[PDB]
Design a protein around this ligand. Structure first.
Ligand code: F3S
Ligand code: ZN
Ligand code: ZN
Lengths: 66, 90, 135, 258, 47
């Protein structure tokens, strides 16, 4: 739904690098270069960002009333 | 931790330690293997779901097994203190 | 297979399970008898005082309440066929949290109540996983 | 028995350890993960939550947020010697008006000003229109042996010390090494980054007679990477102090039985 | 009991004393209402 706070494999924090990465990649930059500039060097942490699906944006339109 | 003796002699000791795991067991086995007079030394973790280890020491009789264990603990303490002293000045 | 416990503690493969419960205030044609949703009193099929501790003043539990197996979610008494207790309880050995309460009407005009209960599932020894290659 | 610094780059610290046994170095590597106290969210008190995320999901997300703990190891009671002086309170009260709103880590207010989130740009939850959250969390020290949220590091590495020797001359070594240990300088093979060698031995199946690869027996390389709560040098000292505590307790219990 | 007329996640709140011919939102006439979460403080363990 929303980006995890930490990488699943190691305990590195990845949630604060999601907005810069996604904003710059849809701006036309190379994903590998953006990831290397952000400091994400291990592929365990790179799969966290390269495979995230932002579903909370769709879900906020159908939140349970309670 | 809570310890108890399974079998003790002058040249043999089987000690069970509750609340410990690989971090202390491997260190103690490695320290024991360099104590002069120890013939065999090993540690066992009977089940990975339980936090408990067993130490097994066999000596030639020139030194007691308990004395060898205490000497190994002293060696580990010296190494830890030296590491603390040397990390503060890097 | 062997799985990482630290990965699971960081949120990997966690899941939630949902279950639904429903009632309907049936209005009998014979004699103009009908059911009512209300906290059951000392009636024919009473279960115990502590099983109705979670119902509100209208006979239905409230969201964000922890329930255990056997707890009553909707209180209901039926016309005699004295009044009988026909409440609906949580199933045996299934804890959870009340997730949603819905009150509406059917085509006839009977009250319809739906309660959703959610249960958190954390991966453990004994759970099944598969790949896209049949493993 | 010295310690040599390789590199200090932000949250990473790399060292060379000489004349230490591998058992001690691996015990330090494990203790820096398992037995170093860190401030983290223990439980959350919810007043209201209209967000798309459930209470348990938000609680887990809050528990995974790092907090600065350097000053908290002398003003707070560790979990080994279990209110004031035990817990700290952090508040969050937000609401969206008419358009979706994203809640970050800078929206968390701590009663004690020395315990703050490491980063203020961590996305907590996205709120829809008119949704609101108001909660209160309690933070306490803990060890990574209990939950991995209390670990102060991310990676902790000990590897062998390499010895790379160039015997002849071959251009294939630069091609086949994944670590970039070799380079060509004036038509000859030289070693640039010897300490980056991971003893892959991939160079020995192509440059069989031109390169020699060994490991130094008494030297080891230690890498740790902090997550933000504590500085890398404090973690290595806290691990050794924990080892000393355990060893002293075991020694006392042993000597109290003969 | 406190309810909430559901046209979306949130709408005007209504209470039980408002008696009508049936279950319906007094303000808009919609036929589905939802119970609100009580203000009791809930303790959640952060594991
Ligand atoms: S190919 Fe590569 S990293 Fe080490 S031993 Fe051989 S060099
Ligand atoms: Zn990672
Ligand atoms: Zn309405």
């Amino acid at each position: 739904m929303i980006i995890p706070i930490r990488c699943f494999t190691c305990g590195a924090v990845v949630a604060d690098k999601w907005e810069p990465f996604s904003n710059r990649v849809m701006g036309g930059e190379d994903p590998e270069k953006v990831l290397t500039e952000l400091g994400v060097n291990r592929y365990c942490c790179r799969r966290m960002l390269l495979s995230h699906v932002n579903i909370i944006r769709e879900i906020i339109h159908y939140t349970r009333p309670i | 931790m809570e310890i108890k003796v399974i079998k003790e002699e002058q040249n043999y000791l089987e000690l069970q330690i509750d609340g410990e795991e690989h971090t202390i067991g491997n260190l103690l086995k490695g320290m024991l293997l360099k104590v002069p007079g120890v013939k065999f030394a090993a540690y066992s973790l009977p089940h990975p779901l339980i936090t408990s280890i067993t130490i097994k020491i066999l000596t030639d009789g020139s030194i007691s097994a308990r004395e060898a264990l205490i000497k190994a603990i002293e060696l580990a303490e010296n190494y830890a203190n030296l590491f603390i002293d040397e990390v503060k000045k890097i | 297979i062997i799985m990482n416990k630290s990965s699971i503690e960081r949120g990997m493969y966690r899941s939630t399970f949902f279950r639904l419960y429903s009632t309907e205030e049936v209005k009998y044609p014979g004699g103009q008898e009908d059911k009512i949703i209300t906290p059951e009193a000392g009636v024919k099929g009473y279960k115990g005082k502590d099983y109705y501790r979670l119902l509100e003043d209208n006979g239905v539990v409230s969201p964000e309440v922890e329930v255990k197996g056997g707890d009553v979610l909707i209180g209901k008494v039926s016309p005699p066929r004295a009044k009988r207790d026909t409440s609906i309880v949580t199933r045996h050995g299934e804890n959870g949290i009340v997730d949603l309460v819905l009150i509406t009407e059917t085509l006839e005009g009977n009250k319809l109540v739906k309660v959703r209960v959610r249960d958190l599932r954390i991966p453990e020894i004994g759970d099944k996983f598969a790949t896209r290659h049949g493993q | 028995m010295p310690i040599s610094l390789i590199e200090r780059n932000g949250l990473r610290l790399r060292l060379v350890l000489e004349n230490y046994p591998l058992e001690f170095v691996n015990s330090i590597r494990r203790a820096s993960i398992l037995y170093v106290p860190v401030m983290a969210v223990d439980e959350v008190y919810f007043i209201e939550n209209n967000s798309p995320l459930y209470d348990e999901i938000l609680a887990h997300r809050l528990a995974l947020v790092p907090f600065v703990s350097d000053e908290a190891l002398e003003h707070y009671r560790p979990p080994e010697e279990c209110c004031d002086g035990c817990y700290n309170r952090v508040y969050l009260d937000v609401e969206a008006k008419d358009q979706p709103l994203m809640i970050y880590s800078r929206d968390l207010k701590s009663e004690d000003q020395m315990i703050t989130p490491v980063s203020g740009a961590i996305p907590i939850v996205l709120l829809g229109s008119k949704q609101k959250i108001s909660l209160e969390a309690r933070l306490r020290l803990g060890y990574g042996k209990e939950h991995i949220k209390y670990s102060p590091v991310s990676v902790s590495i000990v590897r062998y010390y390499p010895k790379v020797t160039v015997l002849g001359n071959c251009e294939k070594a630069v091609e086949v090494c994944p670590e970039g240990v070799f380079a060509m300088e004036n038509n000859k093979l030289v070693v640039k980054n010897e300490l980056s060698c991971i003893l892959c031995e991939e160079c020995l199946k192509y440059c069989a007679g031109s390169v020699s690869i060994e490991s130094v027996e008494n030297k080891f390389i230690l890498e740790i990477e902090s997550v933000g709560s504590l500085k890398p040098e404090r973690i290595l000292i806290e691990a050794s102090k924990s080892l000393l505590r355990k060893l002293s307790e075991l020694k006392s219990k042993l000597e109290a039985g003969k | 009991a406190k309810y909430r007329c559901g046209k979306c996640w949130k709408e005007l709140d209504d209470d039980q004393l408002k008696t009508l011919p049936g279950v319906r939102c007094p303000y808009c006439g919609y036929r589905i209402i939802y119970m609100v979460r009580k203000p009791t403080v809930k303790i959640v363990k952060a594991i």
